[PDB]
Design a protein around this ligand. Structure first.
Ligand SMILES: *[C@@H]1CC[C@]2(C)[C@H]3CC=C(C=C)[C@H](C)[C@@H]3C[C@@H](O)[C@@]2(O)[C@@]1(C)C(=O)O
Length: 145
């Protein structure tokens, strides 16, 4: 019925950027436009995370993929459309497409975590809320490494 945890990707500096917020009613689909962190960046690394903490290392890793072929351009210029789609079949599709060329890549994640363990991740997130927000402020926008 609901996404029991926030679902997102890692932005510059190991920052958790949520696309599907905790308690979102399923089916659900969200999209954010992302960019490159450094000049002439040839591609982006999509790292799929679950959890509430501000830094991805403290959340759970679900999968990875790279979208390469990004032409040389300055930082913050390329447009990378990243969509998270949760279906009613227990299939999570994460797609990243380069808006300039149409070049894309994707990962499929299925549901095959305990209720208490889910309850702990949200407990831990509000306990570490301040420390997490400090690291976020210090290290962060919509930039992808
Ligand atoms: C944490 C790990 C991932 C997942 C099993 C999700 C993976 C695939 C999905 C497909 C529609 C769902 C978005 C799943 C929702 C949820 O059960 C899940 O996010 C967690 C909390 C889990 O229970 O293992």
């Amino acid at each position: 019925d609901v996404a029991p945890l926030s679902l997102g990707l890692e932005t510059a500096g190991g920052v958790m950027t949520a696309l599907i917020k905790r308690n979102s009613t399923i089916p659900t689909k969200q999209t954010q436009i992302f960019t490159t962190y450094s000049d002439n960046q040839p591609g982006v690394l999509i790292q799929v995370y679950e959890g509430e903490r501000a830094m991805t290392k403290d959340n759970n890793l679900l999968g990875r993929f790279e979208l390469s072929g990004i032409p040389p351009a300055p930082r913050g210029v390329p447009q990378i459309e990243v969509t998270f789609d949760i279906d009613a079949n227990g299939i999570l599709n994460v797609t990243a497409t380069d808006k300039s060329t149409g070049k894309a890549n994707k990962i499929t994640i299925t549901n095959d975590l305990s209720k208490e363990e889910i309850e702990r991740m949200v407990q831990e997130a509000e306990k570490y809320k301040a420390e997490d927000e400090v690291q976020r402020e210090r290290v962060s926008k919509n930039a992808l490494e």
